[PDB]
Amino acid sequence: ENTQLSEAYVEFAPDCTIDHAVALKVHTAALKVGLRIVYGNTTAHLDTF
Amino acid sequence: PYLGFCPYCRHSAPCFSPIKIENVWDESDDGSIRIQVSAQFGYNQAGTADVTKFRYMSFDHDHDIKEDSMDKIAISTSGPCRRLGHKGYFLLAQCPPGDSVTVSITSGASENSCTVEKKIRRKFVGREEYLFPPVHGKLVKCHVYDHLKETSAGYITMHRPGPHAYKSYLEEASGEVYIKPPSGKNVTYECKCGDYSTGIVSTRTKMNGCTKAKQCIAYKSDQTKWVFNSPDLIRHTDHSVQGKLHIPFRLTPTVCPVPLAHTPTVTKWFKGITLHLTATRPTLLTTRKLGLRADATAEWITGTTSRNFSVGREGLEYVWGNHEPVRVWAQ
Amino acid sequence: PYLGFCPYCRHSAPCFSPIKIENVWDESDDGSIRIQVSAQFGYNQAGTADVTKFRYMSFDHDHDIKEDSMDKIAISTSGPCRRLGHKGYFLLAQCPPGDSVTVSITSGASENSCTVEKKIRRKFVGREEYLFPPVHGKLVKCHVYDHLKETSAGYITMHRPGPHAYKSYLEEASGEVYIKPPSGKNVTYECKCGDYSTGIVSTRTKMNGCTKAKQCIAYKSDQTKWVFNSPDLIRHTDHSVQGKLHIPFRLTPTVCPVPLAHTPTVTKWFKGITLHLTATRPTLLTTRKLGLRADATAEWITGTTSRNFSVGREGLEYVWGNHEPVRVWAQ
Amino acid sequence: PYLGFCPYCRHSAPCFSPIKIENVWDESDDGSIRIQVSAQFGYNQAGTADVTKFRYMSFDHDHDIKEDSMDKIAISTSGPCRRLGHKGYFLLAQCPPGDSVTVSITSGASENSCTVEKKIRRKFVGREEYLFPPVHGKLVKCHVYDHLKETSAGYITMHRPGPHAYKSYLEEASGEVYIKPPSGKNVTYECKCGDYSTGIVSTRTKMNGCTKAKQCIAYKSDQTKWVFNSPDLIRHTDHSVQGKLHIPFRLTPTVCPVPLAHTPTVTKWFKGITLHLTATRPTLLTTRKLGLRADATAEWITGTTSRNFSVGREGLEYVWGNHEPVRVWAQ
């Protein structure tokens, strides 16, 4: 009548800080575009949605 | 410096060694391997840092802490492994591919080894196999265990050691159980020999009502040390976290060189391509169409071969090994 | 201590060495290997038992019996092998897997090795492959070679040595053949130099009618020894069996520890099961129906997978690895 | 004794060693391997023939030619390679199968190795695989590298060494660059520190207009030696061919022994054969019809099997392993 408690559990491996996957859920994809416009002699760069 | 139950000692059988492995990590892109054994490294007898020697557990009923030098430890998986670094509880070395890892101390003719299974596989980085990092090639992102001793990949928790019984402490004489503590060490003992009984004896003491030697336990109160949470020790009553020590050799990012495969030869025809490929090693070719439907395919080739690919007006893209993507548009 | 025509010497060729293996056994469940060479071990110069030394054949025209120590013998198949026992003519050692076995004596720089082909394959016991005997597992029946020196797996028959000619014993001078026996040893000689002639000379003696050194033979009468019935030696005229020496390291039965695979997960449906299986190593699953028709199937799996099995009213039986058989009956 | 850029030194990285391999030949039927490293063997310090020792390049800023003995070099692919011979720039050795070849010099603890990839495979001669040349069998035509040191497979071209800059020769002090040639050696120097300048200094000399160490170069005029046309050296301005040295160990033809496989058992029926075959090793069977159409087939088998072959009135021919061709004609 020699009782033993046996226990175990899990955690993150010590080097998971670099080797790890992340689970994400995305929504409607917003597109943003960079444009160069040249009119006559004048050109311009700009980013727009 | 605890000693625990290795599954494979020197000869054939599981048994107790100071240099049991318990767990292994092999994720470094170089194949550098980090090992944890119950032994220590880089510390002298009192624990002060001294690189040339290490301390470990004794094979005696006094069970003190003994010592030896770095020149007589060896690591081997299939052939001998080159040690890269050591920090207290931890080792790190380069190993050839194999199925299990062995740590061995050769104290002259006193050989003590532990072996544990781990399918270490020669790994590589990039889109092509290679035996060695070539002299010339692209520099890409990789992750290698930092050889520096003073890095930290994490921490491990240590606790006060639990009871550690012995039999030289006990003795049977004329049907009576006596205890024989070593010199000057207050040794705590307990048993029921009938009713329960406990105390501490520093000298040879007799027991009443005790008919068999197996009935009792004695051990010295060594609370001046901290031991890892190993699964092969009976812990103390109070298992509170009492120490943390760093996990050296953090898996740091860096740059690695990778070969550039032979540039294929393109042979062209009506709406499509025939790529002629040469690759001494398994190298990955990955193509995809540039339209609504990707039709992407990926495959590893060896030797020399040729692949036909239909190219639409929308175009086709291919990546050969580590070479940059190449785009095409049919006429 | 005869010397056999080892197919493979140190360098590339067949030669005559004192350590020729002639045959090998590899049946023992632990991979223990029993080897038989023309040398003997554990005996001193006169043959009396001395573990630390062995005697063997001489590389000279006196061809006496020389000696060396155990520490300079080595066994290797793919890597070095650990010697487990030795008894006169026989050796026993554990070896890594390989295609051939090599025995080597290192008498300083005097290297003498014999190599013989044998596809030694890492074998195991049970219904699942494993690298090593695990610490925890079922205890099953095995047969291993007994490490005890004084066991006997049978006997080997020995006879008198036959004639061993030499050319130092003979010489040519002025077109006449003389014999030159070593000191004090009565050396038998014979030849046809025209008509036949035979005798014994203990000292330098001349022969008549003999024009070529190749015409005659001389050799000392060594009837004080017994030699194995080797296929490399010309036997005595009377090849009666005259000695029987035991074959040590009997293959004795015992117990082995064997792993227990992961217990599968049963996922169920109308008259049948879907077993989800995980096994890091090739493990055998064997099932059979409990009706008139067995329809039994057996297969080895690796990795993780799932298998659908129809179960009738009569029921189904399955055995997973070393786990006990399990029975089921459909509703 | 040039030093060059080995892709794999002792530890992990490409670096500069005197014993770099550049190319390997593995075409000899016996598996003998001929190697070329930048070191030269069998010659004493002045270059005079001395088998026991060799000379090689120095790891110092004087960069003279140093020496060691033959017993401290080693060749290894998967296990140690047995050396067979050496002549100056060239080595030849027999060794086990592997994916790369390694030369290593062990000057005590001073270990310097070069490793280069080469898929060396066990090759054989005949129509059947075998590990090892058997004692009994047919003698067939083969080609093996001749172990004789004084053979010649060709020639290699040597030129005068080109410039070899050094940095101990240069120094910066108070924003002025000085040169420090070693004792008594006329060291040529040059740079543009503004305008161009060149000369030779045998003693510590100052330069004008020079503000940085990196601006100039100095090196001794060592025209008394010839170096291989290696791809890791900057050549002299005049790369005329000036020396030719023989390529030792010419691949000579000779006879080799090959096994004779088990003769088939023919089981016969109306217009055809059923050959029963046993072959422990992969052995080639090749048959062809004796009429207008050959219908020839060739295939390797292992184990024990049986093959049915239709035989016409014109007949059939079969060759089993190394056995002679056999002809048949149906009734």
Residue with tokens 């048993």: B191
Q: Which DSSP category does B18 fall into?
A: T
Contacts of C82 in chain B (CB under 8 A): 11
- The pair of structure tokens assigned to C295 is 């329809």
Host H or E run for residue B294:
none
Rg (chain D; Cα; Å): 30
Residue with tokens 């890597």: C79
Determine the Cα angle at D169 with ends D166 and D173, to 5°. 125
Whether residue D17 contacts residue D3, with contact meaning beta carbons closer than 8 Å, is answered with: yes
Whether residue C164 contacts residue C63, with contact meaning beta carbons closer than 8 Å, is answered with: yes
Picking from D112, D110, D133, the residue whose alpha carbon sits closest to that of residue D122 is D133
Separation CA C155–CA C49 (nearest Å):
19
Which residue among D7, D11, D100 sits closest to B134, beta carbon to beta carbon? D7
Q: Would the CB atoms of B154 and A18 count as touching at under 8 Å?
A: no
Scanning every residue of chain B, which has its alpha carbon at the shortest distance from the alpha carbon of A4? B234
Identity of the residue numbered B107 = S
Whether residue D239 contacts residue D159, with contact meaning beta carbons closer than 8 Å, is answered with: yes
Determine the Cα angle at D219 with ends D214 and D223, to 5°. 150
> Residue D265 forms beta bridges with which residues?
D276
Determine the Cα angle at B26 with ends B20 and B29, to 5°. 155
Candidates 3.30.365.10, 3.40.800.10, 3.10.180.10, 2.60.40.3200; CATH matching B4-161+246-255:
2.60.40.3200
Identity of the residue numbered D205 = T
Separation CA D40–CA D225 (nearest Å):
13
Separation CA B132–CA B100 (nearest Å):
22
Q: How many CB atoms lie within 10 A of CB D40?
A: 22
Q: Does C99 touch chain D (CB under 8 A)?
A: yes
DSSP annotation string for A16-48? TTTS--------S----EEEEEEETTEEEEEEE
Q: Would the CB atoms of C131 and B14 count as touching at under 8 Å?
A: no
Separation CA D241–CA D86 (nearest Å):
25
Question: Within the 126-165 window of chain B, which residues sit less than 8 Å (CB to CB) from chain D?
Answer: 131-135
Q: How many CB atoms lie within 10 A of CB B237?
A: 7
Q: Which DSSP category does C291 fall into?
A: S
Rg (chain A; Cα; Å): 28
In B78-155, alpha helices (H): none
Question: Within the 12-71 window of chain B, which residues sit less than 8 Å (CB to CB) from chain D?
Answer: 30
Q: Measured between CA atoms, how close is B285 to chain C, in angstroms? A: 27
- The pair of structure tokens assigned to C81 is 């092998």
Q: Measured between CA atoms, how close is C132 to chain B, in angstroms? A: 8
Question: Within the 228-247 window of chain D, which residues sit less than 8 Å (CB to CB) from chain C?
Answer: none
Residues 6+ positions from B224 with CB-CB distance below 8 Å: none
Separation CA C274–CA C263 (nearest Å):
13
SS3 label, residue C21: strand
Separation of first and last alpha carbons in chain B: 74
3+ Cβ–Cβ pairs closer than 8 Å linking A and B: yes
Which sign, positive or negative, has the C-alpha torsion B145, B146, B149, B150? Answer: negative
Residue C136: phi and psi, rounded to 5, are: -110, 135
Contacts of A13 in chain B (CB under 8 A): 25
Half-sphere exposure of D8 (CA within 13 A, CB side): 13
Cα–Cα distances in angstroms (integers) from residue B194 to residues B4, B191, B215, C186, D287, in the given order: 33, 9, 10, 84, 90
CA B34 to chain centre: 4
> Residue D49 forms beta bridges with which residues?
D43
Identity of the residue numbered B271 = K
Separation CA B250–CA C293 (nearest Å):
60
Q: Residue D127, exposed/middle/buried by CB under 10 A (0-12, 13-18, 19+)?
A: buried
Size of interface A-B (CB pairs under 8 A): 21
- The pair of structure tokens assigned to B272 is 């499509």
Q: Residue B69, exposed/middle/buried by CB under 10 A (0-12, 13-18, 19+)?
A: exposed
- The pair of structure tokens assigned to D9 is 């030194």
Picking from B258, B232, B17, B13, the residue whose alpha carbon sits closest to that of residue B135 is B258
Residues 6+ positions from D175 with CB-CB distance below 8 Å: D211
- The pair of structure tokens assigned to C293 is 């028709």
Separation of first and last alpha carbons in chain C: 74
Separation CA B47–CA B204 (nearest Å):
32
Q: Which DSSP category does B264 fall into?
A: P
SS3 label, residue B215: helix
Q: Would the CB atoms of B135 and D5 count as touching at under 8 Å?
A: yes
Which residue among B143, B154, B253 sits closest to A14, beta carbon to beta carbon? B154
SS3 label, residue C213: helix
> Residue D67 forms beta bridges with which residues?
D55
Whether residue B250 contacts residue B147, with contact meaning beta carbons closer than 8 Å, is answered with: no
Q: How many CB atoms lie within 10 A of CB B283?
A: 24
Picking from B178, B195, B176, B190, the residue whose alpha carbon sits closest to that of residue B219 is B190
Scanning every residue of chain B, which has its alpha carbon at the shortest distance from the alpha carbon of A18? B251
Q: Would the CB atoms of D94 and C8 count as touching at under 8 Å?
A: no
Q: Would the CB atoms of D14 and B135 count as touching at under 8 Å?
A: yes
Q: Measured between CA atoms, how close is A20 to chain B, in angstroms? A: 12
Scanning every residue of chain B, which has its alpha carbon at the shortest distance from the alpha carbon of C83? B11
User: Can you give the three-state secondary structure of chain D, one letter per residue?
Assistant: CCCEEECCCCCCCCEEECCCEEEEECCCCCCEEEEEEEEEEEECCCCCEEEEEEEEECCCCCCCEEEEEHHHEEEECCCEEEEEEEEEEEEEEECCCEEEEEEEEEECCEEEEEEEEEEECCCCCCCECCCCCCCCCEEEEEEEECCCCCCCCCEEEEECCCCCCCCCCEEEECCEEEECCCCCCCEEEEEECCCEEEEEECCCEECCCCCCHHHEEEEECCCCCCEECCCCCCCCCCCCCCEEEECCCCEEEEEEEECCCCCCEEEEECCEEEEEEEEEEEEEEEEEECCCCCCCEEEEEEEEEEEEEECCCCCEEEEECCCCCEEECCC
Separation CA D290–CA B179 (nearest Å):
96
| Residue in D28, D29, D77, D131 to test binding to C, most C beta-carbons within 10 Å | D131
- The pair of structure tokens assigned to C156 is 């080997």
Contacts of B131 in chain D (CB under 8 A): 99-100, 117
Separation CA D197–CA B235 (nearest Å):
78
Q: Would the CB atoms of D100 and B30 count as touching at under 8 Å?
A: no
Residue with tokens 């000899």: D28
Identity of the residue numbered B238 = D
> Residue C264 forms beta bridges with which residues?
none
Whether residue B186 contacts residue B221, with contact meaning beta carbons closer than 8 Å, is answered with: yes
Q: Does B27 touch chain A (CB under 8 A)?
A: yes
Separation CA D26–CA D33 (nearest Å):
5
C234-246 burial, b if ≥16 CB within 10 A, otherwise e?
eeeeeeeeeeebb
- The pair of structure tokens assigned to D104 is 């290593």
Whether residue C186 contacts residue C171, with contact meaning beta carbons closer than 8 Å, is answered with: no
- Resolution of this entry, Å: 4.1
Q: How many CB atoms lie within 10 A of CB C39?
A: 28
Cα–Cα distances in angstroms (integers) from residue C139 to residues A31, B62, C133, in the given order: 66, 35, 11
Separation CA D102–CA A10 (nearest Å):
44
- List chains adjacent to chain D, taking adjacency as at least 3 C-beta pairs closer than 8 Å: B, C
Half-sphere exposure of C106 (CA within 13 A, CB side): 7
DSSP annotation string for B158-174? EE-------STTEEEET
Separation of first and last alpha carbons in chain D: 74
Residue with tokens 């009192």: B46
Separation CA B87–CA B89 (nearest Å):
6
Picking from C309, C301, C160, the residue whose alpha carbon sits closest to that of residue C229 is C160
Q: Measured between CA atoms, how close is B265 to chain A, in angstroms? A: 36
Whether residue C75 contacts residue C102, with contact meaning beta carbons closer than 8 Å, is answered with: yes
Half-sphere exposure of D282 (CA within 13 A, CB side): 9
Structure-determination approach: cryo-EM
Host H or E run for residue B201:
strand B196-201
Which sign, positive or negative, has the C-alpha torsion C120, C121, C127, C132? Answer: positive
Cα–Cα distances in angstroms (integers) from residue B81 to residues B62, B73, B149, in the given order: 34, 11, 19
Determine the Cα angle at B245 with ends B232 and B6, to 5°. 25
Whether residue D228 contacts residue D156, with contact meaning beta carbons closer than 8 Å, is answered with: yes
Which sign, positive or negative, has the C-alpha torsion B229, B231, B233, B238? Answer: positive
Contacts of A15 in chain B (CB under 8 A): 25, 27, 153-154, 250-251
Separation CA B181–CA B204 (nearest Å):
6
Question: Within the 14-33 window of chain A, which residues sit less than 8 Å (CB to CB) from chain B?
Answer: 14-15, 17-19
Whether residue C239 contacts residue C277, with contact meaning beta carbons closer than 8 Å, is answered with: no
Residue B184: phi and psi, rounded to 5, are: 70, 5
Whether residue D324 contacts residue D263, with contact meaning beta carbons closer than 8 Å, is answered with: no
Q: Does D100 touch chain B (CB under 8 A)?
A: yes
Residue with tokens 């002298």: B44
Separation CA B132–CA B94 (nearest Å):
13
- The pair of structure tokens assigned to B149 is 């001793």
